[PDB]
Structure formats: structure tokens, C-alpha cells
Amino acid sequence: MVTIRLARGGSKKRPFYHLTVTNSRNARDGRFVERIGFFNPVATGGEVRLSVDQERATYWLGQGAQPSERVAQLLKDAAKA
Amino acid sequence: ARYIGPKCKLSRREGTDLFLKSGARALDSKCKAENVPGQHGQRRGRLSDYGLQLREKQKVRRIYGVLERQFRGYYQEASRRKGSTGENLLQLLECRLDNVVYRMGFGSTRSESRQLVSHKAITVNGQTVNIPSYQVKAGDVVAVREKSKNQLRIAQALELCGQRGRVEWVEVDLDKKAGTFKSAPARSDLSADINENLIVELYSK
Amino acid sequence: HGFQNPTGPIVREVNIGETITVAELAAQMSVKGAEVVKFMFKMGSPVTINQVLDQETAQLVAEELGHKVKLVSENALEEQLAESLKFEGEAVTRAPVVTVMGHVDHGKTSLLDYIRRAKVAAGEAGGITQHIGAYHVETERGMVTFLDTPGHAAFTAMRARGAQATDIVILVVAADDGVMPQTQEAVQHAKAAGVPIVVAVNKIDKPEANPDNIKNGLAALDVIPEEWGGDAPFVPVSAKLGTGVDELLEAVLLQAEVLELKATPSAPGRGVVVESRLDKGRGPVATVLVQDGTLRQGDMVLVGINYGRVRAMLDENGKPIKEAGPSIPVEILGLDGTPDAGDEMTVVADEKKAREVALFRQGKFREVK
RNA sequence: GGUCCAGACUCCUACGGGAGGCAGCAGUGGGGAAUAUUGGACAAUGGGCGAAAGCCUGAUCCAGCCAUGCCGCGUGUGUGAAGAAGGUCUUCGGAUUGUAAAGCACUUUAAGUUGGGAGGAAGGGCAGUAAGUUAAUACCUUGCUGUUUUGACGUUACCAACAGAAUAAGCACCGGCUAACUUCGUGCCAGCAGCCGCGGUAAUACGAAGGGUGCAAGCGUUAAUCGGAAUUACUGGGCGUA
RNA sequence: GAACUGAAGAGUUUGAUCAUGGCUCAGAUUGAACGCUGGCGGCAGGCCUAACACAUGCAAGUCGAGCGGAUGAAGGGAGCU
Numbered sequence: 001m002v003t004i005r006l007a008r009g010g011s012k013k014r015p016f017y018h019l020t021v022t023n024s025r026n027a028r029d030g031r032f033v034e035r036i037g038f039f040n041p042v043a044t045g046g047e048v049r050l051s052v053d054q055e056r057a058t059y060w061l062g063q064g065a066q067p068s069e070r071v072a073q074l075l076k077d078a079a080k081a
Numbered sequence: 082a083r084y085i086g087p088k089c090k091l092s093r094r095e096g097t098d099l100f101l102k103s104g105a106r107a108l109d110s111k112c113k114a115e116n117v118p119g120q121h122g123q124r125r126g127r128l129s130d131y132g133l134q135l136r137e138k139q140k141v142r143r144i145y146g147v148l149e150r151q152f153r154g155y156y157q158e159a160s161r162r163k164g165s166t167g168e169n170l171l172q173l174l175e176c177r178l179d180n181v182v183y184r185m186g187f188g189s190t191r192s193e194s195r196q197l198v199s200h201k202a203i204t205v206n207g208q209t210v211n212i213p214s215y216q217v218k219a220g221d222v223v224a225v226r227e228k229s230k231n232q233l234r235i236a237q238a239l240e241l242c243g244q245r246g247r248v249e250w251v252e253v254d255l256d257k258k259a260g261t262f263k264s265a266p267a268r269s270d271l272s273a274d275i276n277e278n279l280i281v282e283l284y285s286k
Numbered sequence: 287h288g289f290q291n292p293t294g295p296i297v298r299e300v301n302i303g304e305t306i307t308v309a310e311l312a313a314q315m316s317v318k319g320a321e322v323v324k325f326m327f328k329m330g331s332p333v334t335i336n337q338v339l340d341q342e343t344a345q346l347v348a349e350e351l352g353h354k355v356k357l358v359s360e361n362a363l364e365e366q367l368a369e370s371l372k373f374e375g376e377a378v379t380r381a382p383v384v385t386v387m388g389h390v391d392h393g394k395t396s397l398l399d400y401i402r403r404a405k406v407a408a409g410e411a412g413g414i415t416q417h418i419g420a421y422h423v424e425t426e427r428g429m430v431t432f433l434d435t436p437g438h439a440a441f442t443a444m445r446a447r448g449a450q451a452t453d454i455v456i457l458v459v460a461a462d463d464g465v466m467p468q469t470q471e472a473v474q475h476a477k478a479a480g481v482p483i484v485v486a487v488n489k490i491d492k493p494e495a496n497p498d499n500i501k502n503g504l505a506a507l508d509v510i511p512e513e514w515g516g517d518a519p520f521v522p523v524s525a526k527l528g529t530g531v532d533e534l535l536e537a538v539l540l541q542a543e544v545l546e547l548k549a550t551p552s553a554p555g556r557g558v559v560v561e562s563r564l565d566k567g568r569g570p571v572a573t574v575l576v577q578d579g580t581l582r583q584g585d586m587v588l589v590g591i592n593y594g595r596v597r598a599m600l601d602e603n604g605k606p607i608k609e610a611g612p613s614i615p616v617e618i619l620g621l622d623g624t625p626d627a628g629d630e631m632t633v634v635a636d637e638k639k640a641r642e643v644a645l646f647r648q649g650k651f652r653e654v655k
Numbered sequence: 656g657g658u659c660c661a662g663a664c665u666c667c668u669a670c671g672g673g674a675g676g677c678a679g680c681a682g683u684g685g686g687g688a689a690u691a692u693u694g695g696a697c698a699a700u701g702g703g704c705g706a707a708a709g710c711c712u713g714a715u716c717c718a719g720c721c722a723u724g725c726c727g728c729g730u731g732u733g734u735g736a737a738g739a740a741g742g743u744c745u746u747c748g749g750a751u752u753g754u755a756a757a758g759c760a761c762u763u764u765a766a767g768u769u770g771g772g773a774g775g776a777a778g779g780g781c782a783g784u785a786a787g788u789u790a791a792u793a794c795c796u797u798g799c800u801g802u803u804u805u806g807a808c809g810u811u812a813c814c815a816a817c818a819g820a821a822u823a824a825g826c827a828c829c830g831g832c833u834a835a836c837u838u839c840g841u842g843c844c845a846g847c848a849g850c851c852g853c854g855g856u857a858a859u860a861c862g863a864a865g866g867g868u869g870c871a872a873g874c875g876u877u878a879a880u881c882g883g884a885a886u887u888a889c890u891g892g893g894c895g896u897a
Numbered sequence: 898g899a900a901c902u903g904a905a906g907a908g909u910u911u912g913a914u915c916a917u918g919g920c921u922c923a924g925a926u927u928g929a930a931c932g933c934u935g936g937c938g939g940c941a942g943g944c945c946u947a948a949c950a951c952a953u954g955c956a957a958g959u960c961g962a963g964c965g966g967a968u969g970a971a972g973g974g975a976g977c978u
């Protein structure tokens with residue numbers, strides 16, 4: 001199906017994550033249809049921990065996209081703040 | 082790496098002061114600085130344009146003790162910037178942490194300030210920085226670690242910085258040995274005999 | 287900090303290798319060459335301006351002039367590895383290793399086959415042994431490691447190394463044929479190796495028999511039977527019929543008075559290469575006989591000049607294992623080349639040192655070649 | 656990493672009879688100037704199944720090896736003139752190596768030893784509580800609370816203490832192009848060489864030694880592409896005799 | 898307020914000169930290799946040749962809340978002991 005998951009960039013021992021909407025049967029870092037934010041595990045300083053585009057997330061949720069567990073937690077974390 | 086060895090040979094080869102000793106006694110009465118180093122010191126031997134460009138670039142490099150690859154990096158970044166890369170190069174070279182420490186007067190020579198920086202005795206914004214390439218930003222408050230402020234070298238070099246000519250772009254508090262780097266000096270403030278146009282001509286080739 | 291004029295003489299540091307010249311020695315001494323030449327002439331052997339001298343005289347002249355000296359080790363890596371190699375304690379008895387020697391067709395492969403109940407003599411191209419084989423056998427008295435060697439005169443070198451790692455030699459001689467040239471070669475090898483000899487007269491089932499001329503023949507060769515003076519035990523066997531083999535084995539194991547404490551198995555293992563070959567599917571494979579310590583799977587091993595860590599370790603009949611006792615023969619995989627027989631293998635337990643030492647050895651090996 | 660048919664090539668066999676496909680991850684032989692470990696874990700992100708615990712995952716996350724590249728840091732710092740001894744050159748006076756060394760006084764980055772020490776962690780189990788679910792305070796879904804539980808990397812990043820200058824410089828070049836010069840050997844030899852070209856008795860060009868110049872954990876050589884080449888010329892060339 | 902701003906020549910045909918014209922050099926780059934030498938770390942890269950042949954391990958399984966069936970603990974215990 002169409003799912004929202006995390007694509008890993010960054011570098012060794014310093015991960016960075018892209019919130020990506022994809023077809024489920026793709027490589028973790030391969031094709032995507034849209035990126036709708038990002039999540040920074042380390043952050044620190046002037047960096048932001050995570051950011052999300054609410055409109056795009058809602059539109060893709062309304063089309064039947066199924067978020068992952070981590071993405072499901074992060075979405076409500078962003079909504080809470 | 083780093084250049085380790087005789088330091089009065091460089092002055093003789095370049096033919097100028099090229100401050101490399103503590104400056105306590107003098108420069109003339111240690112190396113008879115009027116002959117080129119080596120067996121054939123008395124020969125004059127005028128040199129071509131390429132020789133002049135090479136001597137100027139080597140003179141600048143030998144004053145800050147920077148090797149060739151890092152000098153290439155500095156030149157590239159200066160050319161990438163705006164406003165007359167020739168003076169941007171000196172603007173960049175004056176912001177090095179070891180050079181800043183030397184200007185503030187905690188070291189006798191550039192090498193001594195470099196060893197102070199490397200051996201974890203200098204804190205830039207209140208945390209230790211031991212890289213003798215850290216570009217000091219205007220307004221940073223360089224200091225000395227409280228466990229190392231009673232070293233004889235700093236106090237000994239303080240008066241030597243007292244009589245060398247005021248820089249008039251950094252400030253220092255002597256009791257706490259802590260100073261502020263107001264801004265990078267303008268091209269006029271530096272010695273107006275380092276003709277950087279030769280460097281620019283050499284590298285643009 | 288002021289400048290003070292020195293008062294006494296100057297002393298330097300002198301670096302002396304295996305050889306040195308008077309001119310360069312004086313150069314390190316900051317003295318003239320003529321003065322040291324006349325100094326040498328005045329005391330002892332005269333020297334030339336460019337004469338090469340040894341370590342001893344160089345150290346003598348360095349010590350008499352007062353300068354500190356230190357000798358240079360031309361093989362510092364090797365001695366550093368040896369000193370850092372190993373040190374352990376404890377001691378446990380090990381299974382004996384016994385090699386079999388004799389003349390051609392005197393019946394040694396048949397003897398080993400009856401002992402192991404294996405009948406390898408049926409195979410073998412041409413009916414003659416051409417390879418040195420090692421077998422670990424569970425006899426009715428204990429555990430033994432047998433080494434079968436070819437008897438032909440063309441494998442003399444292969445016999446020599448066979449006597450280098452045995453500590454006991456069984457000399458088989460045929461009753462009907464008596465003393466033959468390869469018997470003399472075998473006794474010479476045994477005497478050179480400083481190893482006890484147990485003689486076995488074979489083919490006693492033949493009607494000819496006559497197992498007494500061999501006694502005089504071996505006595506003339508400085509091997510005395512149990513009677514008379516008494517050096518080595520004689521025993522009549524029949525190999526094929528299997529009569530007297532029990533007594534031969536008991537006599538062999540009676541030579542367990544040599545104690546043979548193989549040190550702890552907990553020490554890093556050492557061994558000697560016995561049989562090296564190349565396999566199209568698993569690379570260079572080395573059959574090595576452990577001497578002491580223990581060899582474990584996934585261990586960094588330096589053998590000859592080839593190094594490498596053991597990917598796999600088989601026993602004689604396949605069936606991969608993970609351990610190797612003090613005197614067990616094993617086939618190891620993982621080296622980067624085929625070693626030659628007679629080389630020593632040692633567990634280094636430090637990969638870097640093994641690497642530069644092995645490259646070191648390979649380089650001088652190419653230079654020597 | 657499925658089926659059937661045919662083919663080439665290996666193999667097992669008790670001789671009747673079957674099996675195989677590393678251009679998946681490690682690995683071997685071979686070819687080559689030349690390119691690495693039969694490693695750890697599903698802790699994180701994903702994927703398959705399940706309802707849920709959970710199971711699988713050579714994807715992935717991590718380790719091993721190699722100056723292969725890019726970047727950064729060390730191999731000490733200050734004082735120190737009898738301008739030591741030695742080497743080299745010389746007009747035999749001296750000059751140079753050279754404050755360089757020695758001596759004197761400082762500091763401990765990195766490596767060494769020891770003690771502290773995050774972040775990668777979202778969740779799962781249990782009990783209670785509040786909403787909705789109907790017809791129902793039940794089961795179930797969701798909030799919250801309390802307790803418990805999770806890391807291969809890993810002896811993590813990092814921080815502190817200890818002794819001492821101790822553990823750590825090489826390569827190419829020096830006739831012009833092109834920064835850097837003199838001696839000693841050899842004599843159209845031995846040799847060098849990108850192009851001009853050096854060598855036949857005073858060779859700054861061969862081979863060494865002193866000195867110097869470039870780079871620097873690298874330095875040179877070889878191979879290859881573009882540039883310089885306006886030398887395929889659109890930008891931007893020419894054709895009387897080149 | 899920024900997203901660019903940039904272009905060098907030399908040696909060699911002659912007794913000497915100008916031109917034409919080829920050869921060569923000074924720069925930047927490699928999935929490099931070889932020679933000499935070699936302290937540390939961070940981040941990357943690592944069969945370009947034989948789509949040559951492959952020994953041995955692992956790389957694709959899950960669902961008992963779809964279904965028969967066989968293995969059937971803990972226990973309630975009973976009986977003889």
C-alpha cells in the first residue's frame with residue numbers, strides 16, 4: 001500500500017530522517033512520491049527536533065496512507081506541540 | 082605536519098625581519114642576517130618574476146607557519162568570497178586561533194602560541210578549543226584555563242607584547258588574562274609591505 | 287638561563303649494528319679518522335682508513351672513550367615477537383609421536399595398517415609409499431601418533447624432517463633380507479636426531495626366518511639388543527599375521543620414561559608443517575602437527591612466511607573440529623599461500639604484528655632468492 | 656535461491672539408479688599491473704506473516720582489512736657564541752653547516768595507564784482509572800497514572816588524574832624552460848634524458864659528498880581526459896609564392 | 898540583500914631575422930598501479946580483467962484466533978502402599 005515512513009540520511013552514528021510517502025514495496029532510500037517533513041534525533045542548539053507539514057500529512061492520511069509506528073507516534077507528538 | 086628546525090635561516094633567505102624569535106635581544110646579533118643561507122651566501126643573484134612571486138608567497142607562509150595545502154584552501158575560500166581576494170587572504174589568515182592568541186600576548190612566538198592552543202590551555206567562548214586553525218569570530222572572548230594561568234611563559238610574554246606596538250583591535254584584561262577580539266583588522270592595520278598581488282598572480286596561473 | 291662553557295670532554299650516543307667502519311664510527315664520535323687510526327695502531331691490531339670491524343671492537347672503543355653506546359638489532363622485529371610470544375605454566379603428559387623407518391618393501395605400511403585396521407596399502411600407486419602420513423590412533427594401551435615415511439632413497443630429506451619431530455623411532459627390518467642400505471640411512475637419521483630406537487624384525491612367518499643375523503648387523507652399527515650391553519629392544523612381529531604386534535606396542539610404550547610433559551594446553555599452540563597442498567575449492571591447505579599449546583578455530587596463526595587466521599580446521603578424516611591438543615595432526619585452512627614442509631607455526635594473538643613480521647620475512651625471502 | 660523439454664559441463668552410485676547452477680553475503684581457484692572478513696546483531700529504520708505477543712531478514716545498522724582519496728592534528732617550546740667537535744670548501748686569512756648542537760628552564764596535544772560517563776529508546780508486559788460500544792459499569796479500542804522491562808556497536812562520544820621530551824620524517828630536484836651550486840671520481844666509457852641535448856682530462860647535466868630548493872605522512876614514476884591548442888577556428892583560422 | 902566575478906605563456910628549424918607549422922613543457926583530475934618511506938583520527942571508497950569455473954556455511958518465511966490429527970505437562974485426585 002501507500003505508507004509514510006522514515007528515510008535515513010545523515011552519516012555514521014549521526015542519523016537524520018526524512019518523512020516520506022512511498023509505495024510500500026520500495027527500498028528504504030529509493031523512490032518516493034513526496035516528503036512531508038523531517039525528524040532529527042540529535043538536534044541540539046538551533047536545530048529543530050522534528051517538523052511536519054500538517055496539510056500534506058492530512059491529505060495523505062485521507063487518501064488511505066498508512067503511517068508506520070514511529071511515524072504514528074511522531075505525528076501526534078508534533079500535533080501536541 | 083609542521084616545520085621544525087632552524088628559524089633564522091628563513092629570515093636570512095627572505096631578507097626581512099619575519100618575526101620568529103622571542104624578540105628579546107635583537108635579530109641582527111644572532112645570525113648575521115644579510116647573507117642567504119648556505120655556502121654561497123655572499124652572492125647577490127637577482128631573480129626572475131616567478132622567483133619574486135614564489136618568495137612573496139613563501140614569506141607569507143613562513144610567517145604564519147601554514148603548509149601548502151591549507152594555504153590552497155585559504156586562497157580558494159578567499160577567492161570564493163566577495164571584495165578583493167588579495168586582502169581577504171590576510172583577513173582570513175589573521176583570524177586563526179594561534180595568531181589571535183599571539184596578538185593578545187600570551188605567547189612569545191607563533192609556535193609558542195600554537196603549543197598553548199594545542200595543549201588544551203585556551204578556551205574561546207568558555208570551552209576548550211585545541212585546534213590551531215579555529216577561525217575566531219568577532220566578539221569572541223578568548224581566555225586561559227584557570228589551571229594554567231600561573232605558567233611563567235604567559236607572564237613573561239605579557240611585557241614583550243607590552244613593547245611591540247599596539248595592535249589596537251583586541252583588548253586584554255591582565256589580572257584575569259582574558260581578552261576580547263573586537264574585529265578582524267583592516268588591510269591598513271597590517272604591515273603594508275606584504276604585497277599580496279604577487280600571491281594572487283602566482284596562484285592565478 | 288645563561289651560557290656556560292663546558293669543562294670536561296664531550297660524550298655522544300653511538301649506534302653500532304652488526305658491522306661498522308672506522309671513519310663513520312669516528313664521525314659518530316666527533317673525532318678525526320687519523321687520530322682513531324693511530325689510536326688503534328698504538329693498541330693492538332692496526333686498522334685501515336676504511337676497514338670494516340665487528341661489534342665487539344666497536345663497543346670496546348666506544349666504552350674506552352667514554353661515550354654511551356647501544357647495539358642495533360638487525361632482526362629487532364623477530365626477537366621482539368619471540369620475547370612477546372608466550373609464557374605459561376603447568377605440565378601434562380602427551381601422547382607419544384613415533385615415526386616408522388626402514389628399507390623398501392620390508393613391510394612398514396602393512397604394520398601400521400594392522401595397528402590401525404585401515405589397510406591403506408591396498409591403495410597407493412605402484413605399491414610404494416610416496417607421502418609422509420600422520421595418524422592419531424587409539425590403541426588398546428593408549429593414544430599414539432604414528433608417522434609413516436617412504437623407504438626409497440629419493441625421499442631422504444623427507445625422512446630427515448620426519449626424525450625431527452618424533453622422539454621415538456621404530457626401525458622395521460625384514461627377517462629374510464637383513465641389513466640393507468636404507469636401514470643404515472635410518473639408523474644414521476635416528477642417531478643424528480638423538481632419538482631412542484625400537485627395532486622390529488618383520489616377516490617372521492616365513493620359513494627362512496633367521497632373526498639373529500640382524501642382531502649382529504645392528505650391533506656392528508652401534509645398536510645393541512636387550513641382552514649383551516643393552517641399548518634397544520628387539521621384538522619379532524608378523525605384520526600380516528599380527529603376531530608379536532602387542533609386545534612391540536608394549537615395548538614402544540615402555541619408553542614412556544622420557545616423561546614428555548607437553549606443557550599446558552592453555553598456552554598458545556605451536557607446531558610444524560608436515561604436508562602442504564593447494565585445493566581448487568578451498569585454497570592452500572596445511573597439515574600441521576601440534577607440538578604444544580592448543581590451536582583453536584578463528585585464531586591468528588603465523589606459519590612460515592604466509593600468516594593468516596584459520597577459517598576452518600579439519601582432522602585427518604574431515605569432520606571439522608574446534609580444538610587441537612598438544613600432539614594432534616590437523617589440516618588448517620586460511621593461509622594466503624602454500625608453505626613448505628618443515629616450517630613452524632605459532633599463534634600470535636595480535637594481528638598487526640603478524641602482518642608486518644610476515645611481510646618482513648617475505649621481503650627478505652625474495653631478496654635471498 | 657519455482658515447473659517442464661532439450662543441450663554443454665561436473666558429481667554420486669551398492670552399477671539398477673539421481674543431483675547441480677554464487678552476475679545474493681562472506682570465501683576459493685584462475686586471469687590480471689591491480690581491488691578486502693567463511694565477523695556481530697535484529698538494539699534502530701524498513702520488509703514478510705500474525706490479532707497480539709512474536710518469528711524470519713548477508714536489506715540494514717555496525718565492526719575487520721588496505722595512506723585508495725578528502726580533511727584535521729602530532730613528531731615539542733623559550734633562552735642559548737668558546738660562533739664547541741666533526742664534515743665540506745678555501746685566496747690557507749677564513750667561510751659554512753649554525754642557535755643548529757650541547758647546556759639551562761618549561762608543557763603534556765596525540766598515543767600509554769586508571770577512574771567517571773551521556774545519546775542513538777519509539778515501545779512491550781501487568782494493575783487501576785476516564786471516555787465509546789451496545790443492551791448492557793462485561794469483552795474490546797483509546798487517554799492517563801503506578802511498577803517492571805530493551806544497546807550489536809561498546810572498554811562508545813566525551814571528562815578527569817598519572818610519569819616523562821620520553822613514542823613518532825621522509826621523497827624528488829638543483830644547465831635553460833623552472834625555485835635551488837661547489838668540490839671529488841670517470842674520460843664518446845660508465846651513464847643521463849619531457850624538449851633542447853650533456854659525456855672525447857678542470858663535467859654547476861653521469862656517480863658520490865657538503866650546501867640549497869620544493870612538498871610533507873607522504874613523495875616520485877607510469878597510464879588516461881581536458882586545458883594551454885585561435886592546432887577542425889559557431890563564438891574564433893585560412894587557400895598569388897608557406 | 899546573495900545565488901558569480903572571468904581568459905598569462907615558454908623551448909625548439911637560421912650565421913642572424915620575420916612568418917608559417919608541427920613536436921614538447923608549466924595546471925587541474927583518477928575506482929588507479931608501481932618504487933622509496935610510513936604516527937594518529939574523522940568521513941568516504943575498494944575485481945575497471947574471465948556474463949570464467951565454483952568446495953563449504955547462511956541470504957524467505959509466517960499463521961493453532963481456518964482444519965483434522967498426535968505429543969499430550971501442572972493438577973483434582975482415587976487405589977495398592
Ligand SMILES: Nc1nc2c(ncn2[C@@H]2O[C@H](COP(=O)(O)OP(=O)(O)CP(=O)(O)O)[C@@H](O)[C@H]2O)c(=O)[nH]1
Nearest residue numbers: 390391392393394395396414415437489524525526
Ligand atoms: N610374508 C610376509 N609378507 C609381508 C609382511 N608384511 C608385509 N608383507 C608383504 O610385503 C609387501 C610389501 O610390504 P609394504 O608394507 O608395502 O612395504 P613398504 O615398507 O610399505 C614399501 P615402501 O618403502 O615404499 O613404503 C606387501 O605385498 C606385503 O604383503 C609379513 O609380515 N610377512
Ligand SMILES: [Mg+2]
Nearest residue numbers: 027029030031
Ligand atoms: Mg535502491
Ligand SMILES: [Mg+2]
Nearest residue numbers: 027029030031
Ligand atoms: Mg537499484
Ligand SMILES: [Mg+2]
Nearest residue numbers: 082150726872
Ligand atoms: Mg595532510
Ligand SMILES: [Mg+2]
Nearest residue numbers: 394395414415
Ligand atoms: Mg609403505
Ligand SMILES: [Mg+2]
Nearest residue numbers: 411412413414
Ligand atoms: Mg615395482
Ligand SMILES: [Mg+2]
Nearest residue numbers: 390391392463
Ligand atoms: Mg626383496
Ligand SMILES: [Mg+2]
Nearest residue numbers: 594620621622
Ligand atoms: Mg584474505
Ligand SMILES: [Mg+2]
Nearest residue numbers: 656676677679
Ligand atoms: Mg543462486
Ligand SMILES: [Mg+2]
Nearest residue numbers: 658659660661
Ligand atoms: Mg526440468
Ligand SMILES: [Mg+2]
Nearest residue numbers: 659660661662
Ligand atoms: Mg535433457
Ligand SMILES: [Mg+2]
Nearest residue numbers: 661662663664
Ligand atoms: Mg544435460
Ligand SMILES: [Mg+2]
Nearest residue numbers: 676677950951
Ligand atoms: Mg555460479
Ligand SMILES: [Mg+2]
Nearest residue numbers: 677679680681
Ligand atoms: Mg560474491
Ligand SMILES: [Mg+2]
Nearest residue numbers: 678944947948
Ligand atoms: Mg558480471
Ligand SMILES: [Mg+2]
Nearest residue numbers: 683684685686
Ligand atoms: Mg585471486
